[PDB]
Design a protein around this ligand. Structure first.
Ligand code: HEM
Length: 199
């Protein structure tokens, strides 16, 4: 690639697309019941990275990182749908160090690419003020907000060795997402979208 952020993307695009395909395959927008299952999935993942967004060390290198967390937004979307806060059945990952940087990339990048999901949530009359608060674009714009974030990520100046761990972290974050999705939508372990499906 060329930069840390670009290597992260390059090394995780295949798994990202597998997530895209799996999410769409379980029909998150076919019914209120399924959208709620989607929100529970989102709730678990965002709870899992909450401690990373609030990490003292990372907030010193990335100013205002603590305010980027979307866990509260997802929980409010659950409230809008008449659901109480959702709590994962199993123990939640609590990553740290370089691997935690990979999870942060995964979670924040999902904010950049949430435009598609937000459009379809809108079809159900769910918007940034009701039901899809966690999918709404950052006030500064998805792209502008992301580019600023990417600068900070690259500015961590992680060594090639550290990058490897972070990238592995990002891969594990996506992997965890699918594990939670399968449990939430009642799929077998390692279930995937129909083979050959394109994002
Ligand atoms: C059906 C659901 C999804 C679709 C259609 C999708 C689509 C996309 C698209 C088109 C982008 C690029 C946006 C841009 O460059 O402006 C993107 C980026 C990204 N998405 Fe998703 N995504 C989905 C779900 C997720 C999930 C659930 C995660 C992780 C838990 C995720 C993590 C990311 C990351 C990390 C990036 C950043 C890529 C980069 O480095 O440029 N996405 N997504």
């Amino acid at each position: 690639a060329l930069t840390f952020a670009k290597r992260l993307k390059a090394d995780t695009t295949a798994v990202h697309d597998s997530v895209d395909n799996l999410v769409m395959s379980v029909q998150p927008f076919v019914s209120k019941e399924n959208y709620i299952k989607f929100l529970k999935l989102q709730s678990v993942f965002h709870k899992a990275v909450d401690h990373i967004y609030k990490d003292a060390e990372l907030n010193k290198a990335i100013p205002e990182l603590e305010y980027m967390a979307r866990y509260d937004a997802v929980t409010q979307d659950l409230k809008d749908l008449g659901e109480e806060p959702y709590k994962f059945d199993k123990e939640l990952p609590y990553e740290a160090g370089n691997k935690a940087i990979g999870w942060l990339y995964c979670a924040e990048g999902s904010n950049l690419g949430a435009a598609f999901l937000f459009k379809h949530a809108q079809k159900l009359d769910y918007n940034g003020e009701h039901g899809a608060r966690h999918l709404a674009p950052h006030p500064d714009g998805r792209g502008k907000h992301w580019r600023a974030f990417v600068e900070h990520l690259n500015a961590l100046n992680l060594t090639p060795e550290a990058e490897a761990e972070a990238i592995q972290g990002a891969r594990e974050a996506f992997a965890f997402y699918k594990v939670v999705l399968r449990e939430t939508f009642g799929l077998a372990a390692d279930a995937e979208a129909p083979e050959g499906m394109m994002p």
